[PDB]
Amino acid sequence: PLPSPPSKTSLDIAEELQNDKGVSFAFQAREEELGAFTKRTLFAYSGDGLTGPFKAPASAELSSFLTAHPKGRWLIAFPLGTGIVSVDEGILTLEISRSLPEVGSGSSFYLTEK
Amino acid sequence: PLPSPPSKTSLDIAEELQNDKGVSFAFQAREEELGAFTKRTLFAYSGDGLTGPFKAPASAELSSFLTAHPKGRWLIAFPLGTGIVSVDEGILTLEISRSLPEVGSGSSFYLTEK
Amino acid sequence: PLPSPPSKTSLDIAEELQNDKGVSFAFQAREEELGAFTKRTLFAYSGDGLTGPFKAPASAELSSFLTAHPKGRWLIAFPLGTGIVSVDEGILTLEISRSLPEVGSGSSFYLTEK
């Protein structure tokens, strides 16, 4: 009874990153298009604790997705703190508000008509 | 090996709202049906900071979706604070727990067998 | 222009749980497969407040999904506090960081290449 515009998933990729200390993250990058809008979502998960910023090489494809954000960085909520994800010259950085004894999972999206 | 009931997406719409001060939000309203259940999710994003409640006219369709919530309001977590979204006579209000230097993104859902 | 591996939703189920005091939760369990990766997401919603841990019998299927987590428990963010979901002998427990006047909604996922 309420109508919808057409929609599709135009990107859905995942990648595992690991830093020099053996901490590992999985990231998923998703793009949905719906009508005039595009939504890009970053999902992040680690089983590990994190005692400082997480830095690791990212693929060209993930790097492209991450750099597209209108602010060049992704504010992300995890259960025990906040992070910021950004990429520079193919290196992902996740900066954190506080040490995280468990990172858990979170997501960050932007949704635009541009 | 674990079975699922049938499911579908019965609604997926998005809309851009802007207040008198030039702050802009994108909202997405999604309905999933799975077996006996219906899940309605509100996604919200702004690149802007928010220095007080956000108020703006919403479409009839978005207003209908928002008013359906069993509490008549949507509790929503953003990375830096909490909000409540409600609608009255076609005007959306997002009230916030604290000033937000960046709103970022968040979602709020309800899931029911009714 | 950016390629994706194949993906599908391999599980999507929902269930309503109720404790001895009449508090009720809806849980949704979803599995996505994308390329090498599997993502398992638990969605949780209650309209009720919660004044202590929520305990209730869960189906064998939900119990199976919950026990699969690499930590045997799911750290979950709600708007007003944090929880941990686990299952033992078919009884779900949601432990909470603080009393919640409204639980609202939240989700917890893990994403792995195993």
Author numbering:
A (entry chain A), B (entry chain A), C (entry chain A): 232 to 345
What do the paper's sentences say?
The purified 171–345 construct protein crystallized in space group F23 after a period of about one year. After structure solution by molecular replacement, it was noted that density for residues 171–231 was absent. Coordinates and individual atom anisotropic temperature factors were refined at 1.33 Å resolution, leading to excellent agreement of the model with the data. The fact that density for residues 171–231 was absent even when maps were calculated using low-resolution reflections only, combined with the long lag-time before crystallization, indicates a possible proteolysis event during crystallization. The first is that there is no room in the crystal lattice at the bottom of the head domain to accommodate a shaft domain; the second is that residues 232–234 point away from the three-fold trimer axis and away from each other, instead of downwards towards a potential shaft domain. The electron density for these residues is clear enough to make this interpretation reliable, while the low refinement R-factors suggests we are not missing a major part of the structure in our crystallographic model. Disorder predictions by the DISEMBL program suggest that residues 230–236 have a higher probability of being disordered, which also suggests the head-shaft junction of the fibre may be flexible and more accessible to proteases than the head domain. B. Side view of A. There is not enough room for a shaft domain in the crystal packing; furthermore, the amino-terminal ends of the structure point away from each other and from the three-fold symmetry axis where the shaft domain is expected to be.
Trimeric fibre proteins protrude from each of the twelve vertices. These fibre proteins have an amino-terminal virus-binding sequence, a central shaft domain, and a globular, carboxy-terminal fibre head domain involved in initial receptor-binding. The SnAdV-1 fibre head is the first Atadenovirus protein structure to be solved at atomic resolution. Despite the low sequence identity with other fibre heads, the topology of the beta-sandwich is identical to that of known adenovirus fibre head structures and contains ABCJ and GHID beta-sheets (the E- and F-strands in the long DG-loop of human adenoviruses 5 and 2 are absent). However, it is significantly more compact, making the 107-amino acid long SnAdV-1 fibre head the smallest adenoviral fibre head structure known.
